Amino acid sequence: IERPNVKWSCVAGLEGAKEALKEAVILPIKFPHLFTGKRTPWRGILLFGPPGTGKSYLAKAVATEANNSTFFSISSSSEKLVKNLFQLARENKPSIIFIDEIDSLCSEAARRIKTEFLVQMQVDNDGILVLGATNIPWVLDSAIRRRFEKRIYIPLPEPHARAAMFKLHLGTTQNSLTEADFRELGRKTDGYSGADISIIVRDALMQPVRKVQSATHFKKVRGPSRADPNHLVDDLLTPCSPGDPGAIEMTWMDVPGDKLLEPVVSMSDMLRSLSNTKPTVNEHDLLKLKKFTEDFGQEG
Ligand SMILES: *CCC(=O)Nc1cccc(Nc2nc3c(-c4ccccc4)cccn3n2)c1
């Protein structure tokens, strides 16, 4: 329906999962004549691991890289909607279907309606591949589990990958972090999820705006004009502390919209929000993934 645009370079770490998804998804689409007869792409791939390890984000990256294929990102949030889901799949080949939080399935009447998904997997399906993703792979019943013949564990990020993701979640916003800073944020965040890092920087991003909304004084300052970044101007105002040279008793209401110079995102800012959040994952939840990682292996 709509095409994602995530490049390989943008996803941090996950080098192992990239090589397997290249071997299982991308290389067969670009080179169909290699996968003939005995070898054809697996019917469905299952991504499992701790929450916020990039499983869903990795699904968008693999969808962007085939380009020839089409991306149908259906949510975990009705059999005629999936009958046409596979019907529109087979008309446009090659194609892939990502089902985030596929632990959805597996007490209730909706339980009965869950059978419509397995009809399609085993009809003619060649250019269609189903990406499954979940954080609790064990609750999944055996009928779908035997259907994803390839299962990939997405691990917690490594220090280099966490340092990257602190830089990536910043984007183009004004900050004063050095490359040596990002590396230091990697070491201090051991066991932190990918979602956990995204939580930290959004709070750190909100401290400039909080400083503006709370400042009782502003100081005139030089800087690039908000109309043209190439022309330095002098009438800009930035939050100051009540005693700095040039303090003016005024709040953000008295600052014109085009005269505010935003304060930069510090490193102490990011450390201040790092200290206020702790890793979501626990050691118990991971060894339960260890239980799944060995009981069934790849297709058992
Ligand atoms: C090239 C532009 C771009 O895509 N930047 C960007 C911004 C945020 C994150 C990433 N890559 C990335 N995200 C993750 C996660 C993750 C983050 C947030 C929430 C859930 C998961 C986990 C693991 C790896 N990873 N890379 C790129």
From Swiss-Prot:
* Keyword Transcription regulation in annotation: no
Q: Which domain of life is it from?
A: Eukaryota
Is Ubl conjugation a UniProt keyword of this protein?
no
The top EC class, named as a word, is hydrolase
**GO cellular component labels:** ATPase complex; centrosome; cytoplasm; cytosol; endosome; endosome membrane; extracellular exosome; Flemming body
Q: Where are the transmembrane segments?
A: none
Give its localization.
Late endosome membrane
Instruction: Quote the record's binding site residues for ATP.
Output: G49, P50, P51, G52, T53, G54, K55, S56
What topology does it adopt in the membrane? Answer: Peripheral membrane protein
Cite the GO molecular-function annotations of the record: ATP binding; ATP hydrolysis activity; identical protein binding; protein homodimerization activity; protein-containing complex binding
Which positions does the record annotate as the modified residue Phosphoserine? S266
- Catalytic activity line of the entry: ATP + H2O = ADP + phosphate + H(+)
Annotated GO biological processes are: angiogenesis; autophagosome maturation; autophagy; canonical Wnt signaling pathway; cholesterol transport; endosomal transport; endosome to lysosome transport via multivesicular body sorting pathway; ESCRT III complex disassembly
Q: What is its EC number?
A: 3.6.4.6
- Provide the alphabetized UniProt keywords: ATP-binding, Cell cycle, Cell division, Coiled coil, Endosome, Hydrolase, Membrane, Nucleotide-binding, Phosphoprotein, Protein transport, Transport
| Known tissue expression | Ubiquitously expressed.
Q: What result follows from mutating E101Q?
A: Defective in vacuolar protein sorting
What's this protein's function? Involved in late steps of the endosomal multivesicular bodies (MVB) pathway. Recognizes membrane-associated ESCRT-III assemblies and catalyzes their ATP-dependent disassembly, possibly in combination with membrane fission. Redistributes the ESCRT-III components to the cytoplasm for further rounds of MVB sorting.
Q: How does it assemble?
A: Proposed to be monomeric or homodimeric in nucleotide-free form and to oligomerize upon binding to ATP to form two stacked hexameric or heptameric rings with a central pore through which ESCRT-III substrates are translocated in an ATP-dependent manner. In vitro, associates on the inside of a helical tubular structure formed by a CHMP2A-CHMP3 polymer. Interacts with CHMP1A, CHMP1B, CHMP2A, CHMP4B and CHMP6. Interacts with VPS4A; the interaction suggests a heteromeric assembly with VPS4A. Interacts with VTA1.
**What is recorded about the domains?**
The MIT domain serves as an adapter for ESCRT-III proteins. It forms an asymmetric three-helix bundle that binds amphipathic MIM (MIT interacting motif) helices along the groove between MIT helices 2 and 3 present in a subset of ESCRT-III proteins thus establishing the canonical MIM-MIT interaction. In an extended conformation along the groove between helices 1 and 3, also binds to a type-2 MIT interacting motif (MIM2).
Q: Which family does it belong to?
A: Belongs to the AAA ATPase family.
What is the protein's given name?
Vacuolar protein sorting-associated protein 4B
Q: Which organism is it from?
A: Homo sapiens
Taxonomy, top ranks, is: Eukaryota, Metazoa, Chordata, Craniata, Vertebrata
